Ligand binder design. Structure first.
Ligand SMILES: *[C@@H]1O[C@H](CO)[C@@H](O[C@@H]2O[C@H](CO)[C@@H](O[C@@H]3O[C@H](CO)[C@@H](O)[C@H](O)[C@@H]3O)[C@H](O)[C@H]2NC(C)=O)[C@H](O)[C@H]1NC(C)=O
Ligand SMILES: *[C@@H]1O[C@H](CO)[C@@H](O[C@@H]2O[C@H](CO)[C@@H](O[C@@H]3O[C@H](CO)[C@@H](O)[C@H](O)[C@@H]3O)[C@H](O)[C@H]2NC(C)=O)[C@H](O)[C@H]1NC(C)=O
Ligand SMILES: *[C@@H]1O[C@H](CO)[C@@H](O[C@@H]2O[C@H](CO)[C@@H](O[C@@H]3O[C@H](CO)[C@@H](O)[C@H](O)[C@@H]3O)[C@H](O)[C@H]2NC(C)=O)[C@H](O)[C@H]1NC(C)=O
Ligand SMILES: *[C@@H]1O[C@H](CO)[C@@H](O[C@@H]2O[C@H](CO)[C@@H](O[C@@H]3O[C@H](CO)[C@@H](O)[C@H](O)[C@@H]3O)[C@H](O)[C@H]2NC(C)=O)[C@H](O)[C@H]1NC(C)=O
Ligand SMILES: *[C@@H]1O[C@H](CO)[C@@H](O[C@@H]2O[C@H](CO)[C@@H](O[C@@H]3O[C@H](CO)[C@@H](O)[C@H](O)[C@@H]3O)[C@H](O)[C@H]2NC(C)=O)[C@H](O)[C@H]1NC(C)=O
Ligand SMILES: *[C@@H]1O[C@H](CO)[C@@H](O[C@@H]2O[C@H](CO)[C@@H](O[C@@H]3O[C@H](CO)[C@@H](O)[C@H](O)[C@@H]3O)[C@H](O)[C@H]2NC(C)=O)[C@H](O)[C@H]1NC(C)=O
Ligand SMILES: *[C@@H]1O[C@H](CO)[C@@H](O[C@@H]2O[C@H](CO)[C@@H](O)[C@H](O)[C@H]2NC(C)=O)[C@H](O)[C@H]1NC(C)=O
Ligand SMILES: *[C@@H]1O[C@H](CO)[C@@H](O[C@@H]2O[C@H](CO)[C@@H](O)[C@H](O)[C@H]2NC(C)=O)[C@H](O)[C@H]1NC(C)=O
Ligand SMILES: *[C@@H]1O[C@H](CO)[C@@H](O[C@@H]2O[C@H](CO)[C@@H](O)[C@H](O)[C@H]2NC(C)=O)[C@H](O)[C@H]1NC(C)=O
Ligand SMILES: *[C@@H]1O[C@H](CO)[C@@H](O[C@@H]2O[C@H](CO)[C@@H](O)[C@H](O)[C@H]2NC(C)=O)[C@H](O)[C@H]1NC(C)=O
Ligand SMILES: *[C@@H]1O[C@H](CO)[C@@H](O[C@@H]2O[C@H](CO)[C@@H](O)[C@H](O)[C@H]2NC(C)=O)[C@H](O)[C@H]1NC(C)=O
Ligand SMILES: *[C@@H]1O[C@H](CO)[C@@H](O[C@@H]2O[C@H](CO)[C@@H](O)[C@H](O)[C@H]2NC(C)=O)[C@H](O)[C@H]1NC(C)=O
Ligand SMILES: *[C@@H]1O[C@H](CO)[C@@H](O[C@@H]2O[C@H](CO)[C@@H](O)[C@H](O)[C@H]2NC(C)=O)[C@H](O)[C@H]1NC(C)=O
Ligand SMILES: *[C@@H]1O[C@H](CO)[C@@H](O)[C@H](O)[C@H]1NC(C)=O
Ligand SMILES: *[C@@H]1O[C@H](CO)[C@@H](O)[C@H](O)[C@H]1NC(C)=O
Ligand SMILES: *[C@@H]1O[C@H](CO)[C@@H](O)[C@H](O)[C@H]1NC(C)=O
Ligand SMILES: *[C@@H]1O[C@H](CO)[C@@H](O)[C@H](O)[C@H]1NC(C)=O
Ligand SMILES: *[C@@H]1O[C@H](CO)[C@@H](O)[C@H](O)[C@H]1NC(C)=O
Ligand SMILES: *[C@@H]1O[C@H](CO)[C@@H](O)[C@H](O)[C@H]1NC(C)=O
Ligand SMILES: *[C@@H]1O[C@H](CO)[C@@H](O)[C@H](O)[C@H]1NC(C)=O
Ligand SMILES: *[C@@H]1O[C@H](CO)[C@@H](O)[C@H](O)[C@H]1NC(C)=O
Ligand SMILES: *[C@@H]1O[C@H](CO)[C@@H](O)[C@H](O)[C@H]1NC(C)=O
Ligand SMILES: *[C@@H]1O[C@H](CO)[C@@H](O)[C@H](O)[C@H]1NC(C)=O
Ligand SMILES: *[C@@H]1O[C@H](CO)[C@@H](O)[C@H](O)[C@H]1NC(C)=O
Ligand SMILES: *[C@@H]1O[C@H](CO)[C@@H](O)[C@H](O)[C@H]1NC(C)=O
Ligand SMILES: *[C@@H]1O[C@H](CO)[C@@H](O)[C@H](O)[C@H]1NC(C)=O
Ligand SMILES: *[C@@H]1O[C@H](CO)[C@@H](O)[C@H](O)[C@H]1NC(C)=O
Ligand SMILES: *[C@@H]1O[C@H](CO)[C@@H](O)[C@H](O)[C@H]1NC(C)=O
Lengths: 438, 121, 121, 438, 127
């Protein structure tokens, strides 16, 4: 009938903190804390927490973390300020096929040398999406009226590496394990964990690549479904293999531009120049689209015809696929993949174009030159998701047209950090039972 | 191990108060760890300062003598330690803890009279 | 308030010791404020440790069996607890603190050696 | 008698600490924590604190914080190092008025452009106080014999905003509340507070602007009133309004000096050319000077003739009253204010003049280029304090003449931090009693 | 001094236990630059270690006491020497090698004994 005061009780409440735990490159795993083997994943009892997917602070903190980490890893590199000269350019004409005609340009310009009184005449191969006519015709680089670039150093590579996320001392991470989870609402499967699973900072804009798989069926997860603006991210049950390759032999030169600074320019091409086909298989794609179109019409309509179309974006990044294949950024058409009108070993090879000057995590005036990679490259990865967007008016609908789109880098990290939330302990608990201290 | 005692009854969570308490103190990516450890130290010292001020310090079950009523809950012990948990109990006391924290500010008054006033020859 | 009894009677100032005891915890503005709060934690932990050597962990008011040597202050009890303030009392004793801290430490050292053999029966 | 111990007694000693700021541009508060509403204030009653406004250590910390934060705010702007090519300047003389003839110059230099193989001949307008002759005659900027000035990039404004200094844990801020307080000696009524009031870091050299006023009379504060080497400081009781404006209609033009760096030069002036006026009401200033001379003679005698002469500085900053007007820096003659002798709707105008190259905190090799502000500019302010300097001829004399002065910026903020001091609490204490430990 | 009589017998260091305890936190005179960040890391690490050891003392109901006893039984498999040759002619240094891999269950036994004693005291004083 008096208070007692208890220390260490299992109450908690929501909070936000700062996090760590790398693995056991630009995503620096040398200045970090190594993880432990065999993490403490303790299965809790009857508690049901209200997990939210769209409001957790961890996604934004991850976004800020990768941004700060990226532009500290680009700091000790070559600043290509002498590269803004006039370029007199001509067509490449070697063994050019029907495509790739004018996509590359043979350019010749002036560039300073170590001894800072003597110049030189060097030549290089820039792409069509990298030079702008100023008006044998003169040319300049596209990024020489906003800011000069920073050439990515060949020593620091930028393949994705696994990391994990701790909670600090006195906090905890609650993990969902329910097999049917629609993003919001409660969950009767809550369990705690110290470091998260193998989260992988992949960069994509239309098709999620090399990520965490689903386990029973394809899961649609979104905001309020009546909205036309909110992304409707789909997670596949089984992966589909993707192969995108560049079948062109490249020669990397070492044009020296200052006292210990090198601009690695693209040389001549050994052999013929072909368009980069960017492949996927028919049968498994058709099967997975069948599974996904079965799991749309559970809550959208009941028998409305579901059709896809190709993307409609303004800039280059939203309207087409964008992904890394080892420092030689691709851009695949993905217009033969969404041309179906579903009612209820051959390939879908894609014209998969390519660009050197990149500007990701879009900020006003911070470009980055990507150096060429010698030889031919090929990547064997797999699609583990979709970033569709519904588009259509009619409430009394007879059809619903889905168009992929994408962008907004934040959403690729809210797709694999959905089963997680950080909480604050607050161990003190007051007024139990009858007592009376002497 | 750690807090898998939530969901269990009040009467079963009182025997496991320490394993949830020993895990309370245990260039970017480098400064964040420093801020985290500093923050953990601040929270632990704040909690121990509150226990030290309250008179009962270092004791898990540190039974004091501040009276109840029906206002700061009227639910009897026949249900709140046979069925009900800690998490649900935090909910119904959530806007009532502050005055009780204030009402526990008497240990100083009855240690100036048990030590400074009494025990004089 | 915070220290609203700082000018009152030294006997009456000791009734509200916790409001001074509560608030000892509470890029240009990075390392500087971090160093300030780590120094505050350092000072508070030094204070609590020095109180803990004397056998007064978790206590705001104690007693100890040391005698008061009159060379520190020849003033008796009829002029100290009635019409003066802690500031003048610290100003009078400010160079008599190290020896009384040492005698208090040696008294606790002698005190701690006289129970472990009586508990060995 | 037997000794008890107490923890948490109200005892404070003087100490040194690093205070943190809080608030509700250059004075960047995006890195500063927000303040609390309605900060508590406790009126201590039976205390006497020995204040000292001339030896407190928070003023030096304020000066260091302002300098370092100013240098932090100067980091993301244009470097402007290649600008000072040999200038050729003519007299601009179009329909300019009779006075200030040959002040502005029409310099015609040529510069590197976005492409690093072309140049462009441009023209700019400069003041005489920014260029020197090097031998139409060739001119060069005054800065690049010592160092290259850094531009203030135009998103950032120079308006002062209030800054509240707090105290960390264990340290208390004591505030003076005696209404007759010359800044030195004991104080009968002391109150504590966690937050200081609104303290704007105003820029001035002779006339303190926008400060905090007095309460009953005009007060006189100094180190040693019989010593003439220390700056005597006076604080007004009622404000006097000042209107400094620049009448000509200048325009700004953008000149590109590289890939992404722009230098803003002064364009052609629309209309006529006039000097910048500065207005102070005559009768109100005469009444205020009467208040000052009435409070001055309590320190020297009832028969001393008091005179005011104009300043006797060596450089421009001590000679002329200097401040900022939202982007432009003024320098005022102020000879028509301090010219009178006192024996026991007309407005005074001042020819304020404009300079652009600013070497502000008196450090060797760092400076400013302030861009011109488009259109006319108006500033309405009010004078709160004066920083006078005695001219002590001989002992036991009958005439004392006072002159304005300053230049040292510590005395500018010493008139706002007089009623504050920082102390460190030592809560340990011992006392004799009758009790025994068991 | 600090680590004074560290090589003495088991009982000789018992009266010199307080000398280590003050100096586990810091000094006062020893309370931007590569020295500063390393000194800050060392200071935070020292505070971390001292607070962890004080918490581990505080769990077993023995806080504020350098010398204490506990009523949990000692299994005979852990050691076999009696009181005669362990408190005399035995320095503290040669004591930790034989009790290296048993300490993690010693801590749990102390924890369970203290929690049972606290629950027993709560049950007894409730009458
Ligand atoms: C999405 O798919 C549509 C449908 O194929 C694509 O539209 C097609 O775009 C191409 C290239 O812009 C058009 O070719 C051009 O058409 C005109 C008219 O014949 C003429 O100037 C040239 O012959 C040239 O080939 C093509 O006609 C057009 N097809 C249709 C049916 O309109 C569209 O480009 C795709 N968008 C994306 C973002 O993938
Ligand atoms: C997702 O999945 C695939 C799984 O293979 C990843 O492909 C791997 O990509 C890395 C990084 O480019 C390749 O490593 C490097 O490859 C070449 C030889 O091909 C050589 O320079 C080095 O030995 C180095 O290992 C790796 O070979 C490649 N794996 C295979 C089997 O070809 C892919 O990068 C992942 N991410 C994305 C965004 O697709
Ligand atoms: C404030 O300033 C006054 C001067 O305006 C200081 O008083 C002066 O102090 C000096 C140094 O002690 C005195 O000089 C000495 O005087 C005699 C000969 O006259 C002799 O003892 C020494 O050879 C030495 O020169 C001086 O007389 C005295 N008075 C005046 C009117 O100048 C005063 O000390 C300053 N106050 C403070 C607190 O610093
Ligand atoms: C403080 O006030 C005094 C008195 O008003 C100012 O002194 C005056 O300064 C002007 C500067 O142009 C002198 O005018 C020039 O003097 C000679 C005359 O032979 C000639 O070179 C020029 O034609 C021009 O008139 C003026 O003579 C001088 N007055 C006296 C009595 O010396 C002084 O400038 C003011 N000081 C400051 C720092 O504001
Ligand atoms: C002393 O305090 C007065 C308070 O009025 C300051 O006057 C104010 O100065 C600011 C900054 O120059 C002016 O803001 C500017 O006004 C216009 C219209 O918005 C525009 O040029 C800018 O966007 C900017 O907002 C403000 O209008 C002006 N207030 C008045 C009533 O005139 C004065 O600057 C302070 N004096 C100092 C710091 O020396
Ligand atoms: C600050 O203001 C004082 C105000 O006295 C200026 O001193 C005066 O300046 C004028 C102009 O240079 C001197 O010339 C006189 O002007 C008029 C014609 O404009 C006429 O009275 C005389 O024929 C003569 O030329 C004048 O002698 C001088 N002194 C006085 C006592 O009036 C001073 O130049 C200003 N200082 C600065 C640094 O701008
Ligand atoms: C791009 O143009 C340059 C000239 O600007 C070509 O370089 C010349 O190539 C021929 C044929 O191989 C050589 O004989 C010359 O010596 C080269 N000139 C210089 C100055 O190096 C270059 O081959 C062109 N690249 C193509 C067609 O891919
Ligand atoms: C992508 O798919 C295409 C079409 O199946 C492949 O191109 C053909 O490959 C075969 C086998 O080597 C060649 O005989 C044909 O000449 C190719 N046809 C073309 C280029 O039109 C291509 O090899 C596949 N790429 C990958 C990486 O799997
Ligand atoms: C992408 O590449 C993989 C790896 O080469 C292809 O898998 C091959 O499929 C053929 C089909 O006849 C098999 O004979 C090979 O054995 C497979 N290779 C391996 C290493 O197992 C896959 O078909 C490609 N996907 C496309 C072209 O869509
Ligand atoms: C989860 O909830 C169920 C609710 O029925 C608990 O089962 C019984 O709960 C009652 C009252 O809550 C207890 O008296 C019984 O002893 C419980 N039976 C069993 C077999 O546990 C269940 O225990 C809850 N789970 C936990 C871990 O407390
Ligand atoms: C400063 O001098 C320049 C020339 O160096 C003047 O610019 C010329 O002005 C005349 C008169 O209007 C025009 O006919 C020319 O076409 C202008 N030339 C250029 C290159 O702009 C400029 O007006 C002068 N500025 C003044 C007098 O304020
Ligand atoms: C400062 O005061 C002077 C003198 O009163 C003002 O100058 C007059 O301004 C008016 C209005 O602009 C003009 O019509 C007069 O010709 C001026 N008188 C002269 C030149 O003798 C001046 O404008 C005031 N400045 C302010 C208020 O900023
Ligand atoms: C400085 O400028 C202000 C603002 O224009 C002047 O204040 C005005 O004074 C006139 C005098 O007739 C009044 O009618 C207005 O109502 C005032 N306006 C405001 C906003 O206060 C002021 O007089 C000027 N100071 C001088 C000339 O010394
Ligand atoms: C170069 O490419 C342009 C682009 O259309 C084309 O008009 C021109 O004929 C080409 N010249 C040669 C020599 O191939
Ligand atoms: C710079 O380029 C131009 C145009 O091709 C050429 O005339 C000149 O020789 C080049 N080299 C120099 C100036 O060293
Ligand atoms: C899919 O990609 C993962 C890496 O994300 C890879 O390990 C695996 O082999 C791929 N294929 C599957 C699951 O069939
Ligand atoms: C998720 O499930 C909850 C269950 O209450 C429902 O209210 C909500 O609308 C669902 N949200 C989506 C996006 O399907
Ligand atoms: C709606 O869907 C359910 C589930 O597939 C089905 O049983 C029902 O007949 C459908 N109703 C209509 C009107 O299509
Ligand atoms: C590229 O060219 C070199 C020339 O020696 C050759 O050895 C190599 O195999 C080529 N790489 C390809 C075709 O991928
Ligand atoms: C505490 O919150 C509950 C839930 O809203 C409310 O009924 C109760 O009145 C609150 N107690 C107060 C305001 O004292
Ligand atoms: C009291 O202090 C004096 C002065 O230090 C000393 O001589 C005397 O022995 C002390 N008396 C005691 C400890 O009884
Ligand atoms: C202690 O301080 C007092 C007061 O200032 C002084 O009289 C006394 O001499 C000091 N004692 C010593 C030993 O310094
Ligand atoms: C230009 O100004 C100077 C300085 O006042 C003067 O000597 C020169 O005569 C002026 N030239 C003209 C053409 O007015
Ligand atoms: C000065 O101003 C007048 C009046 O606006 C204008 O007509 C004239 O061109 C200008 N120049 C001269 C020399 O009067
Ligand atoms: C300030 O006033 C006090 C009180 O009269 C006096 O003791 C002190 O000397 C004065 N200081 C100055 C600098 O005038
Ligand atoms: C300054 O000139 C501009 C451009 O002609 C004009 O719009 C503006 O009104 C002028 N300002 C003044 C105060 O005359
Ligand atoms: C300054 O004062 C003198 C008298 O001391 C007077 O003759 C003169 O005109 C005044 N000058 C100004 C500019 O007010
Ligand atoms: C202590 O136990 C560990 C864990 O198996 C083992 O490696 C080690 O050899 C053991 N030491 C002794 C002395 O038994």
């Amino acid at each position: 009938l008096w208070v007692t005061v208890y220390y260490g009780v299992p109450v908690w409440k929501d909070a936000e903190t700062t996090l760590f735990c790398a693995s056991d490159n630009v995503w620096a795993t040398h200045a970090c804390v190594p993880t432990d083997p065999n993490p403490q994943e303790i299965h809790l009892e009857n508690v049901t927490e209200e997990f939210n997917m769209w409001k957790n602070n961890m996604v934004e903190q991850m976004h800020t973390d990768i941004i700060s980490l990226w532009d500290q890893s680009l700091k000790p590199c070559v600043k290509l300020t002498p590269l803004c000269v006039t370029l007199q350019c001509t067509n490449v004409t070697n063994n050019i096929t029907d495509d790739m005609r004018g996509e590359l340009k043979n350019c010749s310009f002036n560039m300073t040398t170590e001894l800072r009184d003597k110049k030189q005449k060097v030549y290089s191969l820039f792409y069509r999406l990298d030079v702008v006519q100023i008006n044998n015709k003169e040319y300049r680089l596209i990024n020489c009226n906003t800011s000069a670039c920073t050439q990515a150093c060949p020593k620091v590579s930028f393949e994705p590496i696994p990391i994990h996320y701790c909670a600090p001392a006195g906090f905890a991470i609650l993990k969902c394990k329910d097999k049917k989870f629609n993003g919001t609402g409660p969950c009767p499967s809550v369990s705690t964990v110290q470091c998260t699973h193998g989260i992988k900072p992949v960069v994509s804009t239309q098709l999620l690549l090399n990520g965490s798989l689903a386990e029973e069926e394809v899961m649609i997860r979104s905001e309020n479904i009546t909205n036309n603006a909110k992304n409707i991210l789909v997670q596949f049950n089984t992966p589909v293999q993707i192969n995108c390759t560049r079948p062109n032999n490249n020669t990397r030169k070492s044009i020296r531009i200052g006292p210990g600074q090198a601009f690695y320019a693209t040389g001549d091409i050994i052999g013929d120049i072909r368009q980069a086909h960017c492949n996927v298989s028919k049968a498994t794609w058709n099967e997975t689209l069948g599974k996904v179109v079965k799991q749309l019409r559970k809550h959208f309509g009941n028998n409305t015809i579901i059709r896809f179309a190709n993307s409609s974006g303004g800039d280059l990044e939203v309207t087409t696929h964008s992904f890394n294949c080892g420092g030689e950024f691709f851009y695949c058409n993905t217009s033969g993949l969404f041309n179906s009108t579903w009612i209820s070993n051959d390939s879908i090879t894609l014209p998969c174009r390519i660009k050197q000057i990149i500007n990701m995590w879009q900020r006003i005036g911070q470009c980055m030159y990507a150096p060429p990679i010698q030889g031919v490259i090929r990547c064997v990865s797999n699609i583990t998701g979709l970033i569709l967007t519904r588009d259509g008016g009619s409430t009394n609908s007879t059809t619903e047209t889905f168009r992929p789109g994408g962008g907004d880098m934040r959403d690729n990290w809210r797709s694999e950090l959905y089963k997680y939330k950080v909480v604050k302990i607050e161990p003190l608990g007051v007024a139990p039972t009858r007592c009376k201290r002497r | 191990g750690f807090l898998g005692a939530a969901g269990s009854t009040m009467g079963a969570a009182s025997m496991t108060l320490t394993v949830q308490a020993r895990n309370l103190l245990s260039t970017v990516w480098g400064i964040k760890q420093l801020q985290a450890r500093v923050l953990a130290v601040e929270r632990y010292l704040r909690d121990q300062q509150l226990l030290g001020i309250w008179g009962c310090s270092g004791k898990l079950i540190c039974c004091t003598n501040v009276p109840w009523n029906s206002s700061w809950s009227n639910r009897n012990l026949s249900e709140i330690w046979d069925n009900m948990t800690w998490l649900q109990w935090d909910k119904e006391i959530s806007n009532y803890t502050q005055i009780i924290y204030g009402l526990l500010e008497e240990s100083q008054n009855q240690q100036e009279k048990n030590e400074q006033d009494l025990l004089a020859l």
